[PDB]
């Protein structure tokens, strides 16, 4: 709607594409030489890996990076003996855990007083505190030291900002303000890269190869997203549900972000398109589960979603028939596209996994239609089904050629705890963040409203309460993300962690929660419109 016209008419020069692809391929060997240098230490390699992570460029070298870290993790106790640099320990902490190696929080005891707290002497290390702050968002459920590290660096970094000196180094100041507002692991990979490029450009001594490589890499990535949004807009318009339905909302860029969060790299382009098509479609089905649909309509709609057919013509009203027909047609076409690539089984899973989302959605509708506000505890039993994180992960698996089909779906239907925790996060983040919309539409059965109902707390007190439930399940996702390495493909685990990080950017606003449309406007043009000018 808003941006649909824009993407349809933006011009992508295939010659610009080909040149970015070539310059990237031309520089890749030089960067690779840096990682495999026999002259740099393990510490120096970890520093570089983190820099390639920061710049959204690690994936070009994922085989090498994983191997470097598998080996030097075995040497980690030795690498850190007498390593007293706060930012160095914190950088190793980020790199090793991001790559599935659970580096112990005992690493920070060297920065901790006898009281127990982190030494006040750390306040001179403005960079160390920033990197400590960032890694405090990588804690497992038992590591309460990280919540104390986050509070320590934040307050000590806030003091620096409000004071005297912080002025003198503006580019660093701005980077720290950005990081405190949107922590790296509360942000998605490509936006972290976008901002770190601006920051790295202003660091005296920045490597010019890596900077230029990161810019080329970002502009290449962004070229794909625009082409993907263009493709999706054409697809959505040819489907033309807007002509046959009244209540269709504009979820184009939100739906693309639904693929972009999980994976930003160019080789996941097709996967992003598949995910965005499925989301825009299933989102129409979810809007159809509406308190203003009657008992017979919702009964028949739910039943058609169990059978996956048409009705007989033994059935009900027109807009509702149009929606079921479209869903079956969209999913049938996607399955046909994916059949040559031997991935049609995964497309089939979409509507199979959705059958229980539909039955859950039917119950939600009865609550809203009668105006019953359940207990919070009883609401969630339905709400974690409707959250569908197992379905969401299947969508992303479809366009990932190196995730064996029955490997991945084995896992999902084994109900991994990581998918359980993601369900809590999405359900809570979505219902609090969209609360004003929900009350407007009469959806009074929701996570926030049921918690106020149960505990007599106000909206703000319930907001804070479900926040903590949300933080806890995020730590569960982190610990599950690490513990499942060498048991679950890393490619699969990364989508899971990116779900968590995507939910922070879409929904979290300071200490409570907000609507994603407002959050998307903050990074819309830098992500989808303007390339980085190349030095
Ligand atoms: C992060 C993002 C935008 C998309 C990924 C989430 C997935 C997999 C599907 C979209 C779910 C829905 C219906 C969002 C609509 S706002 P709502 O309050 O109506 O959603 P609900 O109906 O509560 O599920
Ligand atoms: Mg609904
Ligand atoms: Mg909701």
Swiss-Prot record:
Pfam families: Terpene_synth, Terpene_synth_C. Predominantly expressed in flowers and siliques but also in roots and leaves. Keywords: Cytoplasm, Lyase, Magnesium, Manganese, Metal-binding. It is an enzyme of class 4 (lyase). One of its GO terms (biological process) is diterpenoid biosynthetic process. Pathway: Secondary metabolite biosynthesis; terpenoid biosynthesis. Gene3D superfamilies: Farnesyl Diphosphate Synthase, Terpene synthase, N-terminal domain. Its cofactor is Mg(2+); Mn(2+). The keyword Amino-acid biosynthesis does not apply. One of its GO terms (molecular function) is terpene synthase activity. A motif (DDXXD motif) lies at residues 286-290. Signal peptide: none annotated. PANTHER family: ALPHA-HUMULENE_(-)-(E)-BETA-CARYOPHYLLENE SYNTHASE (PTHR31225:SF93), OS04G0344100 PROTEIN-RELATED (PTHR31225). The Asp-Asp-Xaa-Xaa-Asp/Glu (DDXXD/E) motif is important for the catalytic activity, presumably through binding to Mg(2+). This is Terpenoid synthase 18. It comes from Arabidopsis thaliana.
């Amino acid at each position: 709607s808003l941006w649909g016209d824009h993407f349809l008419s933006v011009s992508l020069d295939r010659g610009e594409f080909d040149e970015l692809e070539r310059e990237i391929e031309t520089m890749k060997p030089l960067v690779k030489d840096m990682l495999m240098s026999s002259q740099s230490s393990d510490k120096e390699k970890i520093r570089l890996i983190h820099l390639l992570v920061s710049l959204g460029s690690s994936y070009h070298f994922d085989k090498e990076i994983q191997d470097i870290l598998k080996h030097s993790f075995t040497k980690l106790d030795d690498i850190i003996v007498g390593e007293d640099d706060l930012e160095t320990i914190s950088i190793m902490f980020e790199v090793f855990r991001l790559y599935g190696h659970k580096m112990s929080c005992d690493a920070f005891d060297r920065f901790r007083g006898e009281d127990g707290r982190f030494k006040e002497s750390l306040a001179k290390d403005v960079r160390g505190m920033l990197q400590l702050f960032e890694v405090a968002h990588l804690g497992t459920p038992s590591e309460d030291i990280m919540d104390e590290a986050s509070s320590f660096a934040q307050n000590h970094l806030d003091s620096w900002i409000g004071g005297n000196v912080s002025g003198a180094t503006p580019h660093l100041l701005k980077h720290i303000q950005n990081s405190l507002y949107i922590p790296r692991y509360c942000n998605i990979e490509v936006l972290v890269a976008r901002e770190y490029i601006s920051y790295y450009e202003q660091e005296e001594g920045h490597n010019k190869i890596l900077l230029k490589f990161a810019k080329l890499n970002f502009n290449f990535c962004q070229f794909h997203y625009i082409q993907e949004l263009k493709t999706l807009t054409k697809w959505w318009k040819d489907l033309d549900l807007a002509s046959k339905l009244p209540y269709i909302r504009d979820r184009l860029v939100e739906s693309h972000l639904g693929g972009l969060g999980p994976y930003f790299e160019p080789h996941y382009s097709l996967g992003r398109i598949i995910v965005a098509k499925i989301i825009m479609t299933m989102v129409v089905v979810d809007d159809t589960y509406d308190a203003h649909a009657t008992v017979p309509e919702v009964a028949v709609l739910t039943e058609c979603l169990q059978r996956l057919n048409i009705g007989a013509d033994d059935k009900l009203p027109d807009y509702l028939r149009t929606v079921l027909e479209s869903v079956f047609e969209v999913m049938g076409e996607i399955e046909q596209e994916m059949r040559p690539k031997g991935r049609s089984y995964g497309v089939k899973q979409v509507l199979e996994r959705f059958k229980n989302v539909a039955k859950a959605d039917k119950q939600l509708t009865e609550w809203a239609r009668t105006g019953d506000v359940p207990s919070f505890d009883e609401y969630m039993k339905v709400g974690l089904v409707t959250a569908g994180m197992d379905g969401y992960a299947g969508y992303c698996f479809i366009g990932m050629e190196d995730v064996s089909e029955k490997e991945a779906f084995e896992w999902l239907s084994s109900n991994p705890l990581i998918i359980q925790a993601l369900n809590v996060m999405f359900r809570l983040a979505n219902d609090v963040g969209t609360y004003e919309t929900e009350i407007n539409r009469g959806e009074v059965a929701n996570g926030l409203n049921c918690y106020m109902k149960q505990y007599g707390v106000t909206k703000e007190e319930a907001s804070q309460e479900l926040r903590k439930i949300y933080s806890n399940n995020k730590k569960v996702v982190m610990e599950e993300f690490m513990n499942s390495h060498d048991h679950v493909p890393r490619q699969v685990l990364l989508r899971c962690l990116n779900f968590a990080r995507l939910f922070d950017v879409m929904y979290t606003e300071g200490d409570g929660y907000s609507e994603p449309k407002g959050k998307i406007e903050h990074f819309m043009t830098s992500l989808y419109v303007h390339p980085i000018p190349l030095s």
